[PDB]
């Protein structure tokens, strides 16, 4: 049975595993942000001929890029919400097995009490039986003395 | 000679179990204070953004 300290250590080990994934996802988000900035700058240099139409085309590119980045954020959050919901459903089923063990523990207590009452009845019954054997011995001797022993004289 | 050879071979592994404890103590204490510099610098950084 994993000691309470090993269960808390396993809980902390799982929290450390979560904190280690956070650092890995942090470094990946930084490298993707730098590579996006280089690619935006390269597209920007090819549009430099100074005219009014170049400026509007650049603003349309920046607006389409912004919309795509936000859509990717929303869809990722919805996927993590689904994963958390499945994990919570699994633990709720192990909760029902625990309720059934609690009920077996109560029925076993009632069985222990019934057996204890029967032990008391048996102890009292054996004490009575010991007393009855002693009376039966005296009754048999008294019958021999009072009823059988006189016959030879008659 | 083999008693002496095996006994020193035991003590060098006890010396090696001291060495693993003090280095792992300094790993734990190094990481404890690393984390605090990152937590501090994030408070200074976010305080600067209010100016904008």
């Amino acid at each position: 049975l994993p000691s309470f300290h090993s269960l808390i250590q396993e809980g902390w080990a799982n929290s450390v595993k979560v904190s280690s994934e956070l650092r890995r996802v942090q470094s990946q988000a930084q490298a993707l942000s730098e590579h996006l900035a280089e690619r935006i700058q390269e597209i920007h240099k090819k549009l430099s001929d100074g005219s009014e139409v170049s400026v509007l085309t650049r603003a349309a590119f920046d607006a389409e890029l912004r919309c795509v980045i936000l859509r990717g954020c929303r869809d990722a959050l919805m996927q993590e919400c689904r994963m958390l919901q499945e994990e919570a459903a699994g633990k709720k089923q192990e909760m029902k097995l625990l309720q059934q063990q609690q009920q077996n523990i109560q029925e076993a207590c009632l069985l222990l009490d019934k057996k204890q009452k029967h032990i008391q009845i048996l102890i009292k019954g054996n004490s009575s039986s010991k007393s009855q054997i002693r009376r039966s011995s005296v009754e048999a001797q008294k019958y021999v003395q009072d009823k059988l022993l006189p016959w030879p004289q008659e | 000679p083999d008693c002496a050879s095996n006994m020193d071979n035991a003590l060098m592994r006890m010396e090696s179990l001291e060495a693993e404890m003090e280095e792992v103590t300094e790993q734990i204490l190094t990481w404890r204070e690393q984390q605090k510099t990152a937590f501090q610098m994030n408070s200074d950084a976010n305080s600067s953004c209010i100016t904008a």
């Binding site: - | 006890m14 734990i28 605090k36 937590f39």
Partner: protein
């Protein structure tokens, strides 16, 4: 024979040091979330589910 006891006393304290260090960092991490999210929304996570 007392170096065995003392290795066994020492690592059973380095496990306590690790566990204690990690609570110092996790409480510091929690505090940063509770001072970057709105205190009304953090209150709705922690307390409005329990309030007479």
């Amino acid at each position: 024979l007392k170096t065995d006891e003392e290795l066994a006393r020492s690592f059973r304290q380095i496990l306590d040091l690790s566990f204690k260090v990690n609570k110092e960092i996790s409480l510091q991490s929690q505090k940063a979330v509770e001072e970057t999210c709105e205190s009304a929304l953090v209150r709705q996570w922690y307390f409005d589910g329990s309030l007479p």
